[PDB]
Design an enzyme around this catalytic site. Structure first.
Site, mmCIF file in Angstrom:
data_model
loop_
_atom_site.group_PDB
_atom_site.id
_atom_site.type_symbol
_atom_site.label_atom_id
_atom_site.label_comp_id
_atom_site.label_asym_id
_atom_site.label_seq_id
_atom_site.Cartn_x
_atom_site.Cartn_y
_atom_site.Cartn_z
ATOM 1 C CG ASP A 79 -22.024 -18.500 20.951
ATOM 2 O OD1 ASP A 79 -23.089 -17.935 20.645
ATOM 3 O OD2 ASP A 79 -20.897 -18.076 20.593
ATOM 4 C CG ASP A 135 -20.136 -17.824 17.497
ATOM 5 O OD1 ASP A 135 -21.241 -17.752 18.076
ATOM 6 O OD2 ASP A 135 -19.042 -17.783 18.108
ATOM 7 C CD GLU A 153 -18.612 -15.365 12.257
ATOM 8 O OE1 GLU A 153 -17.852 -14.736 11.489
ATOM 9 O OE2 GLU A 153 -18.540 -15.277 13.498
ATOM 10 C CE1 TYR A 198 -17.672 -8.321 15.578
ATOM 11 C CE2 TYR A 198 -18.150 -7.437 17.751
ATOM 12 C CZ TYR A 198 -17.986 -8.513 16.901
ATOM 13 O OH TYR A 198 -18.126 -9.794 17.358
HETATM 14 C C1 LIG Z 1 -15.965 -10.020 7.661
HETATM 15 C C2 LIG Z 1 -14.504 -10.377 7.453
HETATM 16 C C3 LIG Z 1 -13.716 -10.065 8.687
HETATM 17 O O1 LIG Z 1 -12.596 -10.832 8.744
HETATM 18 C C4 LIG Z 1 -12.454 -11.642 9.854
HETATM 19 C C5 LIG Z 1 -11.557 -12.696 9.830
HETATM 20 C C6 LIG Z 1 -11.400 -13.526 10.942
HETATM 21 C C7 LIG Z 1 -12.123 -13.316 12.092
HETATM 22 C C8 LIG Z 1 -12.151 -14.065 13.441
HETATM 23 C C9 LIG Z 1 -11.349 -15.401 13.449
HETATM 24 C C10 LIG Z 1 -10.077 -16.031 13.294
HETATM 25 C C11 LIG Z 1 -8.844 -15.375 13.178
HETATM 26 C C12 LIG Z 1 -8.254 -15.238 14.410
HETATM 27 C C13 LIG Z 1 -7.074 -14.589 14.695
HETATM 28 C C14 LIG Z 1 -6.424 -14.062 13.626
HETATM 29 C C15 LIG Z 1 -6.989 -14.165 12.367
HETATM 30 C C16 LIG Z 1 -8.180 -14.800 12.115
HETATM 31 O O2 LIG Z 1 -8.598 -14.805 10.771
HETATM 32 N N1 LIG Z 1 -10.295 -17.317 13.455
HETATM 33 N N2 LIG Z 1 -11.605 -17.551 13.611
HETATM 34 C C17 LIG Z 1 -12.251 -16.381 13.633
HETATM 35 C C18 LIG Z 1 -13.640 -15.714 13.793
HETATM 36 O O3 LIG Z 1 -14.654 -16.133 13.940
HETATM 37 N N3 LIG Z 1 -13.542 -14.340 13.712
HETATM 38 C C19 LIG Z 1 -14.732 -13.468 13.792
HETATM 39 C C20 LIG Z 1 -15.754 -13.387 14.931
HETATM 40 C C21 LIG Z 1 -16.515 -14.465 15.270
HETATM 41 C C22 LIG Z 1 -17.402 -14.307 16.264
HETATM 42 C C23 LIG Z 1 -17.544 -13.038 16.820
HETATM 43 N N4 LIG Z 1 -16.842 -12.001 16.460
HETATM 44 C C24 LIG Z 1 -15.970 -12.135 15.535
HETATM 45 C C25 LIG Z 1 -12.932 -12.241 12.044
HETATM 46 C C26 LIG Z 1 -13.151 -11.439 11.015
HETATM 47 O O4 LIG Z 1 -14.112 -10.531 11.318
HETATM 48 C C27 LIG Z 1 -15.287 -11.224 11.488
#
Ligand SMILES: CCCOc1ccc([C@@H]2c3c(-c4ccccc4O)n[nH]c3C(=O)N2Cc2cccnc2)cc1OC
Length: 381
Positions: A123, A125, A127, A195
């Site tokens: 997968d 991801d 971003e 989301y």
């Molecule tokens: C668009 C900005 C949103 O901010 C985001 C920050 C972080 C993530 C999350 C994440 C983390 C993380 C985990 C626990 C606590 C804090 C964190 O910053 N570490 N890696 C990741 C990640 O990929 N996130 C997002 C995600 C990936 C795949 C599918 N769904 C969500 C998310 C945030 O929102 C994206």
């Protein structure tokens, strides 16, 4: 209906009631577990994100095996190893995807890795891919990845590895990054990140995952909602059976600028930190349930079909049992491939809310039952 769930391997480190390990999973909760995350070396080879992922002397079996061992009591469950996320950023993706030879190093390393550690697919991801160079290199990666997975399956006789991606829901991000027609045939399905439409990064007090737009928010945002993004991916050439709608078990919150201005579209700064998630402006369902018990007032946005709660100057957009069941009726009525959850660890995964009637996974359970016909047990006897 494909019903994937994201497992994050750092949720085991949260405190007390928030600590989440694979043994908190319950059979039939999901059809697919995406392991967040696998990691990459500077040369683009694959490695474990956490040393505790591999069998070790301190944790034992390790999180890879502890997640994959879930396939013995959930005999139709499949697992996937996810790469990327937001914290990963883009610099390493951009380099890895830059050429045929840099991609193949990752591709070969990843396919070997997942077959070694018992996963049924890969997968991505990233971003996010952005710009002509990224857009073409991303299409090349997924085509070349699928190509290698077909070969490996052809050579080995095993069932072919799955090739999926978590993908952007925002129109401008979607446009700048994804050549959908050239991506759709090489993806098994896409996990639509429907989301984080609104969030503490901005002052605009909005909804994390509104199903539809609301006239309470300025028209310029009419596209930032579940329905619009899913339509957008379908319209640009992704078949619906491949569009897996994203469902958050977390929420996004604000410290209001004016405590008596509590309507969607007001203004605020990030929310106060919550106890277990420890990230300002973010919070988990098992934290929201306690806010509701401690005096927060629950509101329902009829246009966007999602709740919000208010407690003092704290304004929180989240999802609950009602919004989940309404999105699931939405998925079925419109004919999408299913729905995935970010994450297992933010649901009340242990029926530990003080308010809880005992239902394990009150949020995710609605997806098991309304999309899978699966009744998730209550905790206890
Ligand atoms: C668009 C900005 C949103 O901010 C985001 C920050 C972080 C993530 C999350 C994440 C983390 C993380 C985990 C626990 C606590 C804090 C964190 O910053 N570490 N890696 C990741 C990640 O990929 N996130 C997002 C995600 C990936 C795949 C599918 N769904 C969500 C998310 C945030 O929102 C994206």
């Amino acid at each position: 209906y494909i019903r994937p769930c994201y497992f994050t391997n750092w949720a085991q480190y949260r405190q007390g009631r928030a600590k989440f390990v694979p043994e908190d999973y319950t059979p039939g909760l999901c059809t697919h577990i995406l392991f967040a995350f696998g990691w990459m070396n500077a040369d683009y080879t694959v490695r474990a994100y956490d040393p505790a992922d591999l069998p070790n002397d301190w944790a034992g079996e390790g999180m890879y095996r502890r997640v994959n061992k879930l396939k013995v009591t959930d005999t139709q469950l499949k697992t996937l190893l996810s790469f990327g996320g937001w914290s990963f950023g883009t610099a390493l993706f951009q380099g890895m995807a830059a050429s045929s030879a840099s991609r193949k190093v990752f591709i070969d390393s990843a396919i070997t890795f997942v077959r070694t550690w018992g996963f049924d697919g890969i997968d991505i991801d990233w971003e996010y891919p952005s710009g002509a160079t990224d857009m073409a290199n991303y299409v090349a990666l997924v085509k070349e990845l699928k190509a290698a997975c077909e070969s490996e399956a052809g050579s080995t006789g095993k069932d072919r590895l799955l090739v999926t991606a978590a993908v952007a829901a925002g129109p401008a991000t979607i446009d700048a990054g994804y050549d959908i027609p050239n991506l759709a045939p090489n993806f098994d399905f896409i996990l639509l990140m429907s989301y984080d439409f609104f969030g503490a990064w901005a002052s605009l007090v909005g909804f994390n995952s509104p199903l539809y737009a609301t006239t309470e928010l300025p028209a310029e945002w009419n596209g930032w909602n579940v329905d619009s993004s899913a339509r957008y991916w379908n319209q640009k050439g992704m078949p619906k059976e491949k569009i897996i709608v994203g469902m958050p078990t977390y929420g996004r919150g604000w410290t209001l600028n004016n405590a008596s201005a509590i309507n969607p579209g007001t203004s605020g700064s990030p929310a106060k930190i919550t106890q277990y998630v420890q990230e300002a402006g973010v919070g988990a369902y098992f934290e929201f349930c306690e806010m509701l018990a401690n005096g927060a007032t629950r509101y329902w946005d009829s246009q966007s079909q999602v709740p919000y709660l208010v407690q003092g100057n704290q304004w929180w957009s989240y999802d609950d049992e009602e919004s989940f069941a309404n999105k699931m009726a939405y998925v079925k009525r419109e004919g999408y491939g299913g729905a995935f959850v970010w994450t297992l660890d933010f649901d009340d995964f242990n029926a530990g809310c003080s308010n809880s009637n005992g239902q394990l996974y009150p949020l995710i359970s609605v997806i098991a039952k309304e999309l899978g016909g699966v009744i998730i047990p209550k905790k206890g006897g």
